Amino acid sequence: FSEKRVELLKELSRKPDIYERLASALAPSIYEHEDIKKGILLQLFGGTRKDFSHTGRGKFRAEINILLCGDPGTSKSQLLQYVYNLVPRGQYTSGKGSSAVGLTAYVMKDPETRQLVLQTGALVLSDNGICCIDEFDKMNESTRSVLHEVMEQQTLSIAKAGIICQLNARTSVLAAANPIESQWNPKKTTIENIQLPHTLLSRFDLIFLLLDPQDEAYDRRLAHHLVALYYQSEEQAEEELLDMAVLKDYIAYAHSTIMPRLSEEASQALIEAYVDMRKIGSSRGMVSAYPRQLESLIRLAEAHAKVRLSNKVEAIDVEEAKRLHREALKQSA
Amino acid sequence: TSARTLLAILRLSTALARLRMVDVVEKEDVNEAIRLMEMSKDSLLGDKGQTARTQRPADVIFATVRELVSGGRSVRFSEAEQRCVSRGFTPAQFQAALDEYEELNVWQVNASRTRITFV
């Protein structure tokens, strides 16, 4: 790192439009649908990990887990291969092509060293980064069971075949589900559409769904955009959009310099906002009574203040955390 | 029809522009591209989607009078002809078309046929 690039990142932090310019850079084709990829930008930051070993709770993850759903090919074809070539800490793997125990750290015979040594996988090497994995709607049954402690307990405890080993690998994992008919059914609620159990969908933070309305005016703002950039070569990409060399250097500085934390005024809004989101009803009923969404709400406030380059969290970033969670409710209802 | 078929239309635009040894596209490469699409979707069924319309010599005449009913009631007979002769409607067929609807009780005229008012 040099001083010829850190000063340019500090001048953009004071601008109130840095959060909107960086969110639109991840959409090189689709004009709308910005709320889907809006939460992905905050996934790379996550938040500063804290320690509480003096109270009996040492391990604690501050990473954000985003949940997606839609047609694997319509609008999710570019959101699964673009976060792999730019981010160096990305590991791509297949769900159905790989085994359940083969993805993590399993046990395999080795007569060369005369000892049952362990083997690596894919998500166990991308620590403090981002993992890439597709096909979550038709994944293996045995693979869904081992995910109850990886992204939840942050401790892969595998004690079988006389092998006592507890891995401490943790990595934010994203998913892209799909309905039973790849289309939203207004005749049924959103609970029956998702085939995943209640214990699986509750571990995710936000939730979105790729909707294709049949409105006539909807195509006037989407079909007129892809054709405009279809015949144009490379005479406008580096003119109206910033390069990718700044995004890779913007996240490699705040992850080891700015450690934000909660205060006494901005933390009082998390209690009042938690009670209002409990008595929802109508759709499912009196749900959301777990410390899961309360813990995920704190991670959203730490990620918004990390992009602003400020350790002090005010009441402005708290109002922006609940706004992203409010849009996720109207999307799945 | 979703976003998967949107990019397929632009793909067929270059299949015909490269056959004439040119680097531009014309209207011929667009009409012929959608011609194979309409023929393929009709072959997936058991019939062909067509239409039926009879060129009535008094169908567009009643639609022209509708432009004056929504604006006023006492429409002048000489003023209503200021828009019929613009496109190219013959005035001889208008005299024989008034009795086709006045007989079926639609509007009414006077003795001199100079006052028309929508009832």
Swiss-Prot record, chain A:
<feature type="binding site">
    <location>
        <position position="77"/>
    </location>
    <ligand>
        <name>ATP 2</name>
    </ligand>
</feature>
<feature type="binding site">
    <location>
        <position position="31"/>
    </location>
    <ligand>
        <name>ATP 2</name>
    </ligand>
</feature>
<feature type="binding site">
    <location>
        <position position="178"/>
    </location>
    <ligand>
        <name>ATP 2</name>
    </ligand>
</feature>
<feature type="binding site">
    <location>
        <position position="295"/>
    </location>
    <ligand>
        <name>ATP 1</name>
    </ligand>
</feature>
<comment type="subunit">
    <text>Component of the MCM2-7 complex. The complex forms a toroidal hexameric ring with the proposed subunit order MCM2-MCM6-MCM4-MCM7-MCM3-MCM5. Component of the CMG helicase complex, a hexameric ring of related MCM2-7 subunits stabilized by CDC45 and the tetrameric GINS complex. Interacts with MCMBP.</text>
</comment>
<feature type="binding site">
    <location>
        <position position="292"/>
    </location>
    <ligand>
        <name>ATP 1</name>
    </ligand>
</feature>
<comment type="similarity">
    <text>Belongs to the MCM family.</text>
</comment>
<feature type="modified residue" description="N6-acetyllysine">
    <location>
        <position position="10"/>
    </location>
</feature>
<protein>
    <recommendedName>
        <fullName>DNA replication licensing factor MCM4</fullName>
    </recommendedName>
</protein>
<feature type="domain" description="MCM">
    <location>
        <begin position="18"/>
        <end position="227"/>
    </location>
</feature>
<comment type="function">
    <text>Acts as a component of the MCM2-7 complex (MCM complex) which is the replicative helicase essential for 'once per cell cycle' DNA replication initiation and elongation in eukaryotic cells. Core component of CDC45-MCM-GINS (CMG) helicase, the molecular machine that unwinds template DNA during replication, and around which the replisome is built.</text>
</comment>
<feature type="short sequence motif" description="Arginine finger">
    <location>
        <begin position="202"/>
        <end position="205"/>
    </location>
</feature>
<feature type="binding site">
    <location>
        <position position="76"/>
    </location>
    <ligand>
        <name>ATP 2</name>
    </ligand>
</feature>
<feature type="binding site">
    <location>
        <position position="57"/>
    </location>
    <ligand>
        <name>ATP 1</name>
    </ligand>
</feature>
<feature type="binding site">
    <location>
        <position position="203"/>
    </location>
    <ligand>
        <name>ATP 1</name>
    </ligand>
</feature>
Curated annotation (Swiss-Prot), chain B:
<feature type="modified residue" description="Phosphoserine">
    <location>
        <position position="78"/>
    </location>
</feature>
<feature type="region of interest" description="Interaction with ATRIP">
    <location>
        <begin position="1"/>
        <end position="119"/>
    </location>
</feature>
<protein>
    <recommendedName>
        <fullName>DNA replication licensing factor MCM7</fullName>
    </recommendedName>
</protein>
<comment type="similarity">
    <text>Belongs to the MCM family.</text>
</comment>
<feature type="binding site">
    <location>
        <position position="4"/>
    </location>
    <ligand>
        <name>ATP 2</name>
    </ligand>
</feature>
<comment type="subunit">
    <text>Component of the MCM2-7 complex. The complex forms a toroidal hexameric ring with the proposed subunit order MCM2-MCM6-MCM4-MCM7-MCM3-MCM5. Component of the CMG helicase complex, a hexameric ring of related MCM2-7 subunits stabilized by CDC45 and the tetrameric GINS complex. Interacts with the ATR-ATRIP complex and with RAD17. Interacts with TIPIN. Interacts with MCMBP. Interacts with ANKRD17. Component of the replisome complex composed of at least DONSON, MCM2, MCM7, PCNA and TICRR.</text>
</comment>
<comment type="function">
    <text>Acts as a component of the MCM2-7 complex (MCM complex) which is the replicative helicase essential for 'once per cell cycle' DNA replication initiation and elongation in eukaryotic cells. Core component of CDC45-MCM-GINS (CMG) helicase, the molecular machine that unwinds template DNA during replication, and around which the replisome is built.</text>
</comment>
